[PDB]
């Protein structure tokens, strides 16, 4: 069945319910969390163009949704808003009880278009996306999130926003667009630490090189920088 | 048995939020009328390692996955509340006989 | 980017209470490991010891007795208090921010960025 | 408790050749979550390669370093004259920082 861990002398066993533990006693339901961990601390890649290729479309495949106790402080955070090319929304609105994973440093606000075959977005790894003490397999629409899986335990006795934009999103040649306004933008690289864009945004801010048209604007960035 | 990790990388210092699980009722700040927001319901804390707990408690839960992903294709409910409460029924049931 | 600025008194008088400040501009200490670290000059690096701004903290256990950190989220200041200094503790010293991560880059708790440092000397 | 001893003490290697700098823990470790630091003089220490393989970033290429029991090794290949400083061992692990002495490399 379902494995489940221990604390002993603060040292984590697997609870063998199979051959049981008698030494260690189990006198309250306040013993029992249930907790939930963040993939950064596996040392799995965290930006966009590593992320987007463990996740993926699928139909035919019910969702589902687990509730967990307490969960990791998290650095990085995921936001979409995908569109299908006929005009509608890849991805399912989400239900009630739903809120947002409510400490993140920072918010990868993503959205813009791609093929989208399938009804849902499963994770291709089997992990949970992480919402408010609600682990779900699903992404919703709009509703920050993060990566990670939950372990179940028996116990012993202010953000800042970054907006992207995506095109072909899903497969393995999508484009990817930072956000300075709705009109102004700069080609992303791989080579850029959000830092590098947060003083991007101050020094175009600085040296007005915005929109003064009604277009579109993609910079790029100096090759030798 | 003690739990070896099998991860490359693994971070030996959590910073937990949680609920704030008991609070003083301090005047009226427990009707939800006078209540904080859903942002400020929370607590946090740290956990300095303690011989690995954290290193073995990460790679409990990817031991936990499989399993629980083969538990929620079982299941036809939404939203499983009640794992919990079925572990200490399994508890009770395998120590009363 | 982000700017380290310690501060604190040049000159010391032996067994008082020696205090320091680091000051954060550019970012934020809420959510990080900061540190303190020893340089006598010409020696090595001797490390003091860190808080993180839940309030917890942690120390080498050489100062165990004689030192004591504190931060202050509200003026975005980071906060040494040496007791009962001597003259063995004139040295150089410096704050640094040993986070796991910052957003995309990996760091796996090294100290990215620094303070400028300070010489700070205990005598009569 | 963990002492980090350096060696050799000091390197005078020529340009273009291949510096190798490696320290040792006094205890078996076996945690890759070590720091390699530049002093400059007059200078904060800076990082070159955490987590025992990783570089940092606004590092060339041409640093790299591992080692996997209580040998840890720095490599340099293509010395450079702007690589003239002290280098740092460090290890973090069981809450706590430790460190080393140093070697002061030259680039003749």
């Known amino acids: 069945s379902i494995p489940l861990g221990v604390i002993h002398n603060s040292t984590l066993q697997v609870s063998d319910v199979d051959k049981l533990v008698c030494r260690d006693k189990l006198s309250s339901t306040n013993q029992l969390r249930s907790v939930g961990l963040n993939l950064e601390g596996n040392g799995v890649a965290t930006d966009v163009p590593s992320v987007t290729k463990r996740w993926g479309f699928r139909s035919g495949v019910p969702p589902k949704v687990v509730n967990y106790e307490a969960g990791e402080w998290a650095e990085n955070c995921y936001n979409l808003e995908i569109k299908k090319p006929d005009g509608s929304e890849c991805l399912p609105a989400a239900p009630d009880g739903i809120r947002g994973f409510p400490r993140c440093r920072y918010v990868h606000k993503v959205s813009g278009t791609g093929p989208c075959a399938g009804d849902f977005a499963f994770h291709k790894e089997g992990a949970f996306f992480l919402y408010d003490r609600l682990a779900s397999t699903v992404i919703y629409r709009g509703t920050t999130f993060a990566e990670g899986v939950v372990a179940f335990l028996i116990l012993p006795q202010y953000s800042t926003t970054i907006r992207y934009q995506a095109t072909g999103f899903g497969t393995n040649e999508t484009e990817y667009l930072f956000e300075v306004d709705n009109l102004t933008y700069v080609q992303l690289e791989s080579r850029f630490t959000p830092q590098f864009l947060l003083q991007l945004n101050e020094t175009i801010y600085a040296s007005g090189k915005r929109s003064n048209t009604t277009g579109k604007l993609i910079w790029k960035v100096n090759p030798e920088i | 048995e003690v739990i070896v990790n099998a991860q490359p990388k693994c971070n030996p210092n959590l910073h937990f939020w949680t609920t704030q699980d008991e609070g003083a009722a301090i005047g009226l700040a427990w009707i939800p009328y006078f209540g904080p927001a859903a942002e400020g319901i929370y607590t946090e804390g740290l956990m300095h390692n303690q011989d690995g707990l954290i290193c073995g408690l990460r790679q409990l839960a990817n031991e936990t996955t499989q399993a629980l992903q083969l538990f929620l294709r079982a299941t036809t409910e939404l939203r499983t509340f009640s794992i919990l409460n079925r572990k200490a029924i399994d508890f009770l049931l395998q120590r009363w006989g | 980017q982000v700017q380290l600025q310690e501060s604190g008194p040049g000159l010391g008088k032996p067994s008082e209470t020696l205090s320091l400040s680091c000051t954060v501009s550019?970012?934020?200490?809420?959510?990080?490991?900061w540190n303190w670290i020893r340089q006598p000059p010409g020696k090595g690096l001797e490390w003091i010891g860190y808080?993180?701004?839940?309030?917890?903290?942690n120390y080498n256990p050489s100062l165990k007795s004689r030192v004591t950190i504190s931060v202050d989220t509200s003026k975005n200041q980071v906060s040494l208090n040496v007791n009962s200094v001597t003259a063995a503790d004139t040295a150089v010293y410096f704050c640094?921010?040993?986070?796991?991560?910052?957003?995309?880059?990996?760091?796996?708790?090294?100290?990215?960025?620094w303070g400028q440092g300070t010489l700070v000397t205990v005598s009569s | 408790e963990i002492v980090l001893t350096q060696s050799p003490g000091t390197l005078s290697l020529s340009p273009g050749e291949r510096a190798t700098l490696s320290c040792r823990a006094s205890?078996?470790?076996?945690?890759?979550?070590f720091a390699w630091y530049q002093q400059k003089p007059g200078q904060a220490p800076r990082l070159l390669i955490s987590?025992?393989?990783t570089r940092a970033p606004g590092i060339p290429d041409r640093f790299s370093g591992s080692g996997s029991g209580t040998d840890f090794t720095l490599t340099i290949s293509r010395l450079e004259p702007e690589d003239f400083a002290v280098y740092f061992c460090?290890?973090?692990?069981?809450?706590?920082?430790?460190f080393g002495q140093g070697t002061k490399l030259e680039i003749k």
């Open positions: 640094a921010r040993g986070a796991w991560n910052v957003a995309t880059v990996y760091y796996y708790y090294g100290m990215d960025v």
């Open positions: 550019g970012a934020s200490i809420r959510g990080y490991f």
């Open positions: 808080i993180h701004s839940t309030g917890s903290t």
């Open positions: 205890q078996s470790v076996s945690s890759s979550y």
């Open positions: 987590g025992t393989s």
């Open positions: 460090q290890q973090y692990g069981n809450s706590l920082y430790t």
